[PDB]
C-alpha cells in the first residue's frame, strides 16, 4: 500500500546563488537576481534581461572535455542534481542502486545548442553539425547522464509540461516511491532558454516584461504595474525517499511531501481561466490527496509569473479554495526575484517552501508597491515574515492548461 | 490491491498508412515505408531516404488556422488522439471529465519549426519569430491541445525518454488508471524528425543506415549487413481505460496491460551495454509488475533498431530473460519496415502487439537475410507467422539508457 516520501536533499542554481544556502539567503533578504543579460548582444530584442546564473563553473562537477558536449540545461541539470545527492548523504550500492531513479525535467530543454547546430546547419552544412548534438540537447538526458555518473538503475524519465515541469517531476517521482517502484528518486527539473530563439519566440507572444530599463523591477507578481514575465535561468534537485528507508539509514528529513494535484484547465492554449478553476481543481486535488482541513494551509508559493491575467487567476483560486481562511495564510511569489525558471521554477519553489517549513518564514513578493484590484491577501509584500508554517503549498500553472499542486509538511 | 486496464482505442500515424488498420495491412504484408525523402534538399547529408508520413491531411482534425499554429508533431500527435478516442467510442461528460487525462510525449519535438524560425532569425531577425512558436513547438502540447478541444480535466503531462517516449508515456498512464488517479488516459508519442536537423544531427553520431541506393532494404534488424536505424515520422496513441468502466458502457476491449517496467542501464550516453543488461531488469520488472514467469511471452516487438550494437544486446537480453524459452517465444522488428519512429516508435509497437494478439500473428522481421552471430532465435524473419499469442511484450530502449517494457495480455 502507499508508502510515506520524505525530502532527503536538495541542490540549486538561481538567478540568486550557485546552492540552496546562498539562493535561500538571497530570498529571505529580498535580493532580486535580474540584470541585462551580458553572454548576447540583444539590442534588436524588446527584452535585454532576466535571471542569469552568474559565475557558474561546471568544472565544480564534470571535466571541460565533458562539459563541452552538454548544453547549460543539462549542466544545470546535473549541477543541482549533485548538489542534492551529496546533501542527502545516500550512499549508492549493489544493494540498493535499482531502487534509485531520476526524473529531472525542461520546459525547452537544449535550446541554445538546437540554436548553434542550427546555425551550423544553414550558414556551413550537415558535415558541421556536433555528433554530441542529439544527446548533449534532448531533455531526458539530465535523467540519462545523473543515472551514467552515479549508476542509478531505477526507473529513468523526464516530464516536459513547460511551466508546471518541475511540479510534475517531484510529483510523479513521489509517487513511484509511494506505489513502490523506487525507494528514491532525485527528481526537479532545469532550464536555460536565454538565447535568441528563447528570447525571441517569448518576445514575439508579447510574454516578457520589457522593462529593460530597471530590470530588478520587472517582476513585481499582483503589482498593477506588471507587464509579463521574466526569464531566469537554473535547476532546483530535491531527494525523495521513503520514510522508512529515510528512517533506516538515519537520514536528516527537511519536510515530508503529504500531497500532489495535477489537473488539466482544458480551458486555452497558453491564457489561464481569470477565475483560476484549474489552479482550484488542482489544490482541491492536491488537499484531499493529502487528507488535509484546507485551514491547515500557512504557507502558498505561487506560481506568481508577473503575468495580468495569471496573477489575478491564483488570487481568485486561493479565495475559492480557502474562503475565509485566505486572509490567514500567507502567499509569495519568489520569482519577484528569481523571475520565472520555466520547467525549473516548480523545483527551486518546492526548495524553497520546504526552506519556509525548516525555517518558520515566509519569503516576500518583492517590487508590490500597488496590489492590484482584488489582490488584498497577505501577499507578504516587500519584507520576508516569520510566521507558524506547518503545511506549505507550492503552485504550477504551464502552456496546455497543465497545473500542478505539492504539499509539505513539516515532520515529527 | 490496483485496478486492471485495458485498452478500448487505438490512433496512429506511420510511414505505412494514415489510420492503424492500413499501418497494420503493411506490416502483415511486409511492405516498407521506406523511401528517399521529397520536398527537401538532401544533397550534402549522408542519408537521403526514411519513414515520412504520406498524404497527411490536418484538416481532418483541425481547422488550417489552429493547425498553422502546431509544428507537425503535435499534429501527427493529434491526429492519433483524435483517431483513438473515436475507435474507443469514449463520450466526455460534465460527470466523467476530471478522471479522464492525456499523457503523449515526444523524444525530440519541433525539429521542423526549430528549422523554420531559425531561418527567420538568422535571415530576417528576432521581429519574424511567430508569435507560436513556444506555444506551437512545446513537446507538452498534444497533451494540452487534445485536453482543451476535448475539455478532458485528469491528469494532464507529456513524457520526453527519447526512443523510450511511447512506451514510457503508455506505462504511466496505465499507473495513472490502476492506482485510481484517472478512469481514461490518451497515451502514446508522436515524432517528426525526418529533416534537415534530424538526418544531420543522428548522421553526425553516424547512428543512421546510409543505404540510399536501397531504402526499403536499409532497416534488417539482427542482419550482418546492418549499418544504423532508418528515421522515420508519425505517432500512436491508445486509449487506456479501467476494466469496469470499460465493461459498464460496452466498450470494445482489445487487450490488457498487464505490465509495465522501467529501467535505467546508468552505462552510456547513446549505447547499450553488450549483454543487455538493462533491457534484461527492464523485462523482468515488467513480467514480475504482471504477475507472469517468463515461459508465459509468446510475442516480443523488440526495439530492433537495426544497429550493430542495439540488436545484440536485445538478443543477450532475452536469452538472460527467458533461459530455455527464448527460442519458443517469437521476436520481430516492425522497425524493419516503418523505420525507427523514435518517441512514437513505442506508441506504435504497443498498437502492433495489441493487434499481434487479436490477429494470432507474429509481425515479419523483413531483410533479415543473413542472421549476424548469436541471433539465432525465432525472428520471424521476411513473413508474418500465424500463432498462440497469449501474452506480448514491447520493448524499447533510448538514449541515457533508459528502458520501458509493457505486456500486453488476451481478454477474454
Ligand atoms: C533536438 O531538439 C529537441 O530536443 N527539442 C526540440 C524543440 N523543443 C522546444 C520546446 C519548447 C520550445 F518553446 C521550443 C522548442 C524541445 C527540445
Redesign the pocket.
Known amino acids: 500500500s502507499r508508502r510515506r516520501v520524505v525530502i532527503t536533499g536538495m541542490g540549486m542554481l538561481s538567478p540568486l546563488g550557485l546552492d540552496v544556502p546562498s539562493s535561500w539567503e538571497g530570498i529571505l533578504a529580498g535580493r532580486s537576481g535580474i540584470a541585462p543579460i551580458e553572454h548576447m548582444d540583444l539590442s534588436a530584442y524588446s527584452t535585454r534581461f532576466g535571471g542569469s546564473v552568474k559565475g557558474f563553473n561546471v568544472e565544480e562537477y564534470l571535466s571541460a572535455k565533458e562539459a563541452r558536449k552538454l548544453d547549460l540545461f543539462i549542466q544545470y541539470g546535473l549541477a543541482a542534481s549533485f548538489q542534492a545527492v551529496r546533501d542527502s548523504g545516500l550512499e549508492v550500492t549493489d544493494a540498493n542502486r535499482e531502487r534509485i531513479g531520476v526524473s529531472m525535467g525542461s ?5 541554445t545548442n ?1 540554436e548553434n547546430n542550427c546555425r551550423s546547419l544553414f550558414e556551413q552544412g550537415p558535415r558541421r553539425i556536433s555528433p554530441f ?2 544527446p548533449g ?3 531526458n538526458m539530465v535523467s540519462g547522464f545523473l543515472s551514467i555518473h552515479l549508476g542509478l538503475q531505477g526507473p529513468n524519465y523526464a516530464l ?1 509540461t ?1 511551466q508546471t515541469t518541475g511540479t510534475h517531476s517531484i510529483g510523479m517521482a513521489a509517487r513511484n516511491i509511494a506505489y513502490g517502484e523506487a525507494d528514491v528518486m532525485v527528481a526537479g527539473g532545469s532550464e536555460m ?1 536565454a538565447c535568441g ?2 528570447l525571441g ?1 517569448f518576445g514575439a507572444a508579447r510574454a516578457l516584461s520589457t522593462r529593460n530599463d530597471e530590470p530588478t523591477r520587472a517582476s513585481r507578481p499582483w503589482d498593477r504595474d506588471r507587464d509579463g514575465f521574466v526569464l531566469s535561468d537554473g535547476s532546483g534537485a530535491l531527494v525523495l525517499e521513503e520514510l522508512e528507508h529515510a528512517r533506516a539509514r538515519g537520514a536528516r528529513i527537511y519536510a515530508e511531501l503529504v500531497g500532489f494535484g495535477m489537473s488539466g484547465d482544458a480551458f486555452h492554449m497558453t491564457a489561464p481561466p481569470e477565475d483560476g478553476a484549474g489552479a482550484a481543481r488542482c489544490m482541491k486535488n492536491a488537499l484531499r490527496d493529502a487528507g488535509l482541513d484546507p485551514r491547515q494551509v500557512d504557507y502558498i508559493n505561487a506560481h506568481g509569473t508577473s503575468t495580468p491575467a495569471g496573477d489575478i487567476a491564483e488570487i481568485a483560486a486561493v479565495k475559492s479554495v480557502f474562503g475565509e481562511h485566505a486572509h490567514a495564510l500567507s502567499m509569495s511569489s519568489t520569482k519577484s526575484m528569481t523571475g520565472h525558471l520555466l520547467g525549473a521554477a516548480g523545483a527551486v519553489e518546492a526548495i524553497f517552501s520546504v526552506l519556509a517549513l525548516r525555517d518558520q518564514v515566509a519569503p516576500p513578493t518583492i517590487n508590490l508597491d500597488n496590489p492590484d484590484e482584488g489582490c488584498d491577501l497577505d501577499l507578504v509584500a516587500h519584507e520576508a515574515k516569520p510566521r507558524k508554517i506547518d503545511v506549505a503549498l507550492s503552485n504550477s500553472f504551464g502552456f496546455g492548461g497543465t497545473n500542478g499542486t505539492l504539499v509539505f509538511r513539516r515532520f515529527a
Chains 1, 2 share one sequence.
Request: proline share 0%; glycine share 30%; no cysteine.
Open positions: 520546459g525547452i530543454g537544449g535550446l538546437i548534438f542529439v540537447s534532448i531533455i516536459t513547460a532558454a530563439l528563447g519566440g
